[PDB]
Symmetry: C3
Subunit: 230 residues, 3 copies
């Protein structure tokens, strides 16, 4: 065993306990419900932290870390996150979409949009030759800007519901979504092994807070909200 | 060529001939049908053995085998199965769901559930350091228990249909599902390279019987059954 | 940087500028539309070239190339294409299906069909030992023949619509689909590193023309067509 040495551990393990406990609680809240509309929402959320948990575990001890060398050294990146964020994200965006009640097409484009967002991101990470890395970085973030756009501009404009509650609750979700996410790109550029300005300890710290707050928080106000009645 | 040496070959090749021939027959049974409800079911099944076939081939000669070293040696695991079971399974569970006629949400959670079940399993396999291997092993099997639960408890409770036939046929499918699957976990722990108690020859034997019986058998009683009328 | 040496570059870079510019234009055409039926189609297309673009980039400079050694040497294959064609294709087939208006089941089988088509193809590429390579090659192409069959025979027979326009437009799409695709298999066998008869320069040339013409062309006549009204 070696779940020590690499300082980041404390941080990882933290994100872990939080994720697992979360999926567990939502797990309960869902139990038996004439909620099928909501039940749908529930299943989605529950799954989200679930994944984040498994991933975080691998990332902690064995899996998740490689040694992408760029610029002139051996960098330790945690690809694992690329996977977890990958599945977790299309699901999330889906949660919002349904909540507001969009349309296959709209959601469809949004899904593929994210897929390329993260996917490309990853490709950059492993890319080596830090210069090209940042290049791919540009592509990905661009995609991100597109999804955000459709979120407020598109969804809000639809966000009209007969129910003031549904309308408000959504607004909050779309907002928090915007802020937290934006952080993701920025942090990765200056931090992690790319610009190499922010140490790995703090880098893992920030990233972590982002995960728990986004998945667990978002999912919480959402389910607890009268949006998924019952 | 080297489709010899490794004794398991005879077993693999066996699973192969069985898989291919199967997908072929179902292939026929489906041909032209005002069955679209059933036609749906058909397409699903047919696909299932199809995949199992391709995979089994790779696994036989070239692809499918690595050398995950743990405990203190070089172990020969057939990751290929991890892939085949991966796609095949979400499909299967889907076949049941529709047959009984559930609801997006329910099926949704079940899908992600399996995904994590197998996925995590794999991660364990490659993990190295046999101790941690078993750890991931625990996580996966847990997920399995969850899916089974929803199957009988949840589906059976719904399994109510106006048609006694549909109700019974299902019952049988859910049952065989339970038994065969349970075998999968157990066998992998004591057998394969983890506990290293069951030789690879017999390990490949048992696993094989499990595949053919599950995919081909399940699919057979199902289609042949009046459930997918026409 | 090394976006030179390997001659193919000029060709790759070409496919690139074409892909990106394409996704950009369709991007516009879609903008704001009471078209949701069509809007659906739009989103699909747009996504298609988008992917092709990102992939083509990686393939150009860093990602996309390995060194699968078979026959008796070190061969340079561009796996990247395997990925791009992978996602792009199920989407395309979906575009056709909806246009004509099929049924979940039919489309479903078609989707899994393609998945295995390309997937297996790839497996062959990396396979090593050129003999076995061609073997997998046979499997894949077979699958291809199946999809084509359902396309004209199945879809055309359904292609009946009340709208002569919809009926014709489709016909054209299914046709071009047939020809271009057939090229794909042939070229890869004689060309690329397998038979080693067609040089890599020309091999990249032909493959390229195939991509741009198929994705961009198909998508063009389609959207511009009154099929996706609005
Ligand atoms: C915990 C999972 C969440 C909600 C995922 C967040 C991450 C993003 C969608 C951000 C993606 C990135 C970019 C925009 C470009 C650079 C690389 C990434 C992956 C950090
Ligand atoms: C032929 C394909 C089938 C129906 C797949 C069966 C396998 C399972 C879903 C079992 C999964 C496992 C665990 C529960 C934990 C240990 C590792 C696995 C993959 C054997
Ligand atoms: C640009 C993307 C498109 C539409 C993809 C085209 C490729 C095919 C579906 C062809 C597949 C192949 C075979 C039939 C067997 C040999 C290997 C492939 C991948 C070239």
């Amino acid at each position: 065993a070696q779940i020590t040495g690499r300082p980041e551990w404390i941080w990882l393990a933290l994100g872990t306990a939080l994720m697992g406990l979360g999926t567990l609680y939502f797990l309960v809240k869902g139990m038996g419900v004439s909620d099928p509309d909501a039940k749908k929402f529930y299943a989605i959320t529950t799954l989200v932290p679930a994944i984040a948990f498994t991933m975080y575990l691998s990332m902690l001890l064995g899996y998740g870390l490689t040694m992408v060398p760029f610029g002139g050294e051996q960098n330790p990146i945690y690809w694992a996150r690329y996977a977890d964020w990958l599945f977790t994200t299309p699901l999330l965006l889906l949660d919002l979409a349904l909540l507001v009640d969009a349309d296959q097409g709209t959601i469809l484009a949004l899904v593929g949009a994210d897929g390329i967002m993260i996917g490309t991101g990853l490709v950059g990470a492993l890319t080596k030759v830090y210069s090209y890395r940042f290049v791919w970085w540009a592509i990905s973030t661009a995609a991100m800007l597109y999804i955000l756009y459709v979120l407020f501009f598109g969804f809000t404009s639809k966000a009209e519901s007969m129910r003031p509650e549904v309308a408000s609750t959504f607004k909050v979700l779309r907002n928090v979504t915007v802020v937290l996410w934006s952080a993701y790109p920025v942090v990765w550029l200056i931090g992690s092994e790319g610009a190499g300005i922010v140490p790995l300890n703090i880098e893992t710290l920030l990233f972590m807070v982002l995960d728990v707050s986004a998945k667990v928080g978002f999912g919480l106000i959402l389910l607890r909200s009268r949006a998924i009645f019952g």
